[PDB]
Design a protein around this ligand. Structure first.
Ligand SMILES: *Cc1cc2c(cc1C)N1[C@H](O)CC[C@]13C(O)NC(=O)N[C@H]3N2C[C@H](O)[C@H](O)[C@H](O)COP(=O)(O)OP(=O)(O)OC[C@H]1O[C@@H](n2cnc3c(N)ncnc32)[C@H](O)[C@@H]1O
Ligand SMILES: [Cl-]
Ligand SMILES: [Cl-]
Length: 385
């Protein structure tokens, strides 16, 4: 017999951030999660996440990235958990052959972002450990960096709970009952009601949004990352080796410097197995591509980091057709907010998104420009059942 002002289903990257924003405003909030965030069954583990500002995916992304960066700095000051390290972010690729690099450079110029432009041997000289052909160019963002994603969610949860937010763990929501003036969720642990609902189930959005009369193409992908023993005199954060996201002939790869000798971490961004969040195999190495795809990149571009595999993780991306997020009110219910399809690049924005979700839930509007994330946009191919 407990009503809430707002109920958040899926207390992960986006949901926990939202819960923190709501709780900080004295809003009676209930956060429900299938597991106990942060955990390793969703899209937020792997310890680290990159945050860049020269977002060429769309201008709207820049302001959100900068607001998120400020929010991350605020979180750092509010918790004892480590939140962010300014490793800087390096983006490189073949000159004139990378839409990603060109887009990044354009975004930097258009928003007057502080960056360094270098090419060929200059890259190899500035960062020993990196070996790119002379026809490669790059753009470096010194003020971007690395977020400790699990710590972010953990910190937001501890802060939210301390302010009154209730967190119901290991409880999978199975259905929704929406009315013009209230929302109700159904779980094996019971039913709950509220005035507003926020839906942010990550990979599971592709399976449960249908329970909200929504038919939106969402494809979950199995994405692995690996930690490799590396030459610490070159790849350590201590010697300023940067975080990175680059485009080479066979795709986009991202990486992180070795922290406290944990080893350089690498991931293959443009490829992943299409899976279902309930049947995905979370063991690293069951597919030969898991490790081989990573080493193929390292031996060519960062040979000193192609050492023994120290650790592996299996995580998920949830892609929309245009790879842009979905942040909007349910088209048939203004009291329901949807956060889905972050397509492999949403964590850096989670702090900002939590703020947006909080505003949408409480006012039906947000001060941020979220037009490109509309649930009604054509390229999404969204429809009602
Ligand atoms: C997986 C992965 C993602 C990202 C990155 C690497 C990997 C291996 N990096 C790379 O380094 C480059 C891109 C990225 C990075 O560094 N910078 C970014 O900005 N993003 C990067 N990645 C993407 C983000 O991690 C994802 O976009 C983000 O985490 C998505 O957040 P969202 O909140 O949607 O998903 P979560 O999985 O965090 O949370 C969902 C939660 O919901 C719960 N759940 C599910 N079903 C439920 C039911 N039925 N009832 C109640 N709760 C439910 C889950 O348990 C989960 O906690
Ligand atoms: Cl391949
Ligand atoms: Cl994602």
């Amino acid at each position: 017999s407990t009503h809430f002002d707002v109920i958040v289903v899926g207390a992960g990257s986006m949901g926990m951030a939202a819960g923190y924003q709501l709780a900080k405003q004295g809003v009676k909030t209930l956060l429900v999660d299938a597991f106990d965030p942060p955990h390793t069954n969703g899209s937020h583990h792997g310890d680290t996440r990159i945050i860049r500002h020269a977002y060429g995916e769309g201008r709207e992304y820049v302001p959100l990235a900068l607001r998120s960066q400020e929010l991350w700095y605020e979180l750092e000051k509010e918790t004892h958990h480590k939140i962010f390290t300014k490793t800087g972010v390096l983006v490189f690729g073949p000159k004139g052959e990378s839409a990603f690099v060109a887009e990044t450079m354009e975004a930097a110029k258009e928003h007057s972002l502080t960056v360094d432009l270098l090419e060929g041997d200059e890259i190899n000289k500035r960062w020993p450990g990196i070996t790119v052909p002379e026809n490669y160019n790059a753009i470096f963002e010194p003020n971007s960096g690395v977020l400790f994603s699990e710590n972010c969610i953990r910190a937001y949860r501890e802060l939210a709970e301390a302010r009154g937010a209730k967190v119901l763990t290991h409880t999978r929501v199975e259905d929704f009952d929406i009315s013009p003036d209230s929302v109700k969720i159904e779980t094996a642990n019971g039913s709950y009601t509220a005035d507003k609902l926020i839906v942010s189930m990550g990979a599971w959005n592709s399976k449960l949004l249908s329970k909200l009369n929504l038919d939106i193409p969402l494809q979950p992908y199995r994405q692995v990352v690996g930690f490799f023993e590396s030459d610490e005199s070159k790849y350590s954060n201590d010697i300023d080796f940067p975080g990175f996201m680059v485009e080479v002939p066979n795709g986009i790869y991202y990486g992180f410097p070795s922290f406290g000798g944990c080893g350089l971490k690498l991931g293959y961004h443009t490829f992943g197995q299409k899976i279902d969040p309930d049947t995905i195999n979370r063991e690293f190495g069951v597919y030969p591509e898991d490790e081989s795809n990573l080493r193929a990149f390292l031996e060519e571009y960062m040979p000193g980091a192609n050492g023994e595999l120290k650790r592996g993780a299996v995580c998920m991306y949830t892609k929309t057709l245009d790879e842009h997020f979905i942040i909007d009110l349910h088209p048939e219910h203004s009291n329901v907010v949807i956060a889905a399809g972050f397509s492999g690049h949403g964590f850096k924005f989670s702090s900002g998104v939590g703020e947006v979700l909080s505003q949408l839930a409480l006012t039906g509007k947000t001060e941020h420009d979220i037009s490109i994330f509309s649930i009604n946009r054509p390229a999404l191919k969204e429809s009602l059942q």
